[PDB]
Amino acid sequence: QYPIINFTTAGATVQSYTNFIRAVRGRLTTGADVRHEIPVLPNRVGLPINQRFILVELSNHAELSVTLALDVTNAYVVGYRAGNSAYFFHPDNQEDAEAITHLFTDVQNRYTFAFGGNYDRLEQLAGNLRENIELGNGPLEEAISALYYYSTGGTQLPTLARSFIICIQMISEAARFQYIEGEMRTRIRYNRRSAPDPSVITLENSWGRLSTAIQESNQGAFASPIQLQRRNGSKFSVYDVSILIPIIALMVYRCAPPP
């Protein structure tokens, strides 16, 4: 009953990846709140649970398929299905736990992780930092096999964690930022994998702050600048929503929009 977007990594191109991410955004929004030309995700409060999630079915060159569940309120992966098993990140508010019981209700085996989905938990689990984990079509292809074979006991947990990190960044963060989508399109266009540079990681770390600064801004103007980093790690200050318009595609809801 939840909407499904399909994507295959095998023979993926800039175009098929672009179409996939646009379709993902399309399902996450309307939610027709746009603040400064930037769509805001639905406020979870008052959100009917039938509208809470979307499903992203990934398949790969090995003909393996896993379906991820994304929370439409933050674009984030809450868990996934592989065959007859479903796995969920440990929630952290009883409304979440409530919400996820409506996911993958037909599956035989449903497990909840001890851990949550945040990069901090995941990075230690993987024994690697985001900056040391390659992204690209290759890593995503492998991530899909890893996620699938976990449902059968053939995947070590640190490989799993690494797989979540790859997926979350190439789907959730890409839906959130045209800039990160751009970074992944480029890796795909040249079939090169590489770890995310500091510009990517700082965007990811600052998504909440960015959303708040934009929705609280005075006519687009930030009362206080936000520091981001360039590709080479040198820092720069954002003072205004204008420069973020071609960077950020979705925002998490923060308060009502002022009339």
Ligand SMILES: O=C(O)[C@H]1O[C@@H](Oc2cc3oc(-c4ccccc4)cc(=O)c3c(O)c2O)[C@H](O)[C@@H](O)[C@@H]1O
């Ligand atoms: O940006 C901040 O200053 C602080 O914001 C906090 O996060 C939120 C802030 C928020 O601030 C506002 C807000 C702020 C000023 C005026 C009107 C509204 C509304 C929110 O819905 C909101 C929210 O949902 C947050 O999660 C964080 O919990 C907190 O860590 C952070 O310090």
